[PDB]
Symmetry: C3
């Protein structure tokens, strides 16, 4: 099983065999909530459309795609022992928030994902990255994963847009896999979670298959009430397949 | 231990022995929060006054009481294996939310109770029953529990009304048992919780016993401060107001 | 290992010996958040400034300090068996709340601390003490602890004031230890950060400060300028040292 190069919520990698079991076949996979990319990295579609609201994520993904060697080399420079302390961390963090250069931002952003508190990505109310120092003994530099993702990206487009716009991009030869922010047990709202179910109903009507993952709850069985449902044990996870 | 025909919060236990331990005796038992009826169903009062704000519940209970055979036969028809899929569950939910016939609604409510998600009874902001499909393997049809409920109901009146109104029907021959929506750890408010203790203080003074159960917390010991308290094992509390 | 005479939040002290391991040396210890006094009672500074916002607390401590004997004597009389029931608990609670005598208030207040639900100290919106009856088998009367506190109090001043005013009383010869109300898993986030800023200003002036809290994304954010130490205990506890 190939690993994502970012520490990122979801694609904590079980449920892969289960997603790949119910994931239908096609020329193209659309992921409106790509995140770490672990579905992308462990399937073999001939092409990919991959999207996410987080503009730092997509921008880094676009750099890894088009400037592979230059990127890896600059970013390796920051995984040295001299950088594993707070004095350097808060220094690199301040540079990230002050910079207008996407390439330097994207080198920094991988440093912050691996040297920061629980690998979180968060922002205060002014748009600044505000995750504090993570106090790790030995952060891994993910060389192999970086190369694997770049190779695999040669068959992908990355967009920074909302789930509605990227699902509109799908067509007759597409399959859609949605991994929205989890239902409860400004962020992603209930209106939006139900909205995501609607678009799917629209897509299957046109013979585009859609698969959605999420917790198993009263609200999730309500919203996906017209998919074929599949509970997977582990609290429980729910897979909803809209199969023409 | 006679089982209730409905699933209903709790469930499903009511620590009945501990309740019956402290529950005084009289001619008539008043429950302002009847719910599933565990206590009604497992005691021997000469008679009962039974009440709840949920009007779907009370209407059902009057129908089981007055039209037993008619009801059991119409409800049994929804328990056939042909109705055990999503397509049918959502249709029946819609039929129930659109019906204005009490009998038909009472018949569909049993189905929704037994085929819906975790046995919940919930409504959206438009008043529609909104529990989704439970996907159960093989729902039990509570035929014996139905008939026991009906037989026992012969000595019982049912009222859809709030706890202050049902509690005013008690007299010197009654006992009152209170199972309100739980204290914390249009829902039932803190002001209503305290209000219930105070209606209880005024009852016990008119020589009418009241027993209340709840979680054991800072707010419940404060509200029940003038009753004898017994802690049972989160912890349960039973506040007894004895003359 | 000397105990506090009050049951009180964080008076449960599974640290030390971690606080003392990390607490610097000096003539005077300032506590802005003394509470029940554990650090005070288990250290050997030549003098102390001890402060808290709760005025029932500070008034009590002034009384135990300055009227040790009449106090111990009057309090002892409430710790009998006829007082360990609700009819009496609520009677004394109403007395405390109605009273304007500080001496009798201080006497009722220890009764309420030991006979009351979970040793809580809480007021309602009218400012009346509102903890209910705690139903304990037999509450212990903290005689020896009272004298130990009184005797140690001879080297102490007590002020009823906010962390900002107490921390201003520290000088060259002082050390400051802050035990604030816990960060979340009423004291505000804005105050939580203000505290760390005053500490920063103290260390600039060569006055050490040690702070204690839960280990969280926020506490690491606020205390980002201290040397930090993590104590396993069950969520982790953080200690933050601002050393010259
Ligand atoms: C992480 N993905 C979910 C994983 C997992 N189910 C969880 O909740 O932990 C969500 C991805 O959705 C992205 N996202 C959030 N809102 C939107 C949106 N409105 N449109 C597209 N992507 C979004 C987040 O950045 C995130 O990368
Ligand atoms: C189920 N009973 C409580 C069981 C349990 N202690 C729990 O909290 O889950 C509560 C019952 O009280 C009813 N109820 C809620 N509010 C009122 C009210 N204001 N007056 C009368 N009954 C009420 C509910 O329909 C419910 O049937
Ligand atoms: C109990 N103390 C220690 C905290 C402990 N870590 C806990 O959260 O359980 C906090 C003390 O600080 C006091 N306190 C609350 N606010 C302030 C303030 N603004 N200034 C000084 N003391 C305060 C409380 O009365 C309390 O006694």
């Amino acid at each position: 099983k190939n690993r994502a190069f970012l520490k990122w919520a979801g694609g904590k990698y079980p449920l892969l065999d289960d997603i790949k079991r119910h994931l239908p076949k096609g020329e193209c996979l659309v992921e409106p909530f790509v995140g770490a990319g672990s579905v992308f990295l462990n399937t073999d579609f001939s092409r990919y459309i991959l999207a996410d609201i987080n503009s730092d994520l997509i921008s880094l993904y676009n750099i890894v795609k088009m400037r592979t060697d230059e990127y890896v080399q600059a970013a390796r420079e920051l995984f040295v022992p001299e950088t594993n302390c707070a004095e350097v961390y808060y220094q690199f963090r301040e540079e990230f928030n002050k910079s207008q250069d996407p390439f330097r931002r994207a080198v920094l952003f991988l440093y912050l994902n691996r040297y920061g508190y629980n690998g979180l990505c968060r922002y205060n109310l002014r748009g600044e990255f505000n995750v504090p120092f993570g106090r790790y003994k030995k952060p891994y530099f993910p060389e192999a994963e970086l190369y694997h993702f770049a190779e695999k990206a040669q068959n992908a487009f990355f967009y920074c847009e909302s789930y509605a716009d990227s699902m509109a991009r799908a067509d007759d030869a597409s399959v859609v896999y949605c991994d929205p922010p989890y239902a409860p047990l400004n962020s992603f709202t209930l209106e939006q979670q139900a909205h995501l179910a609607e678009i799917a109903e629209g897509l299957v009507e046109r013979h585009i298959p859609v698969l959605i993952s999420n917790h198993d709850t009263m609200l999730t069985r309500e919203w996906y009430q017209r998919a074929k449902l599949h509970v997977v044990k582990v609290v429980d996870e729910l897979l909803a397949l809209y199969k023409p």
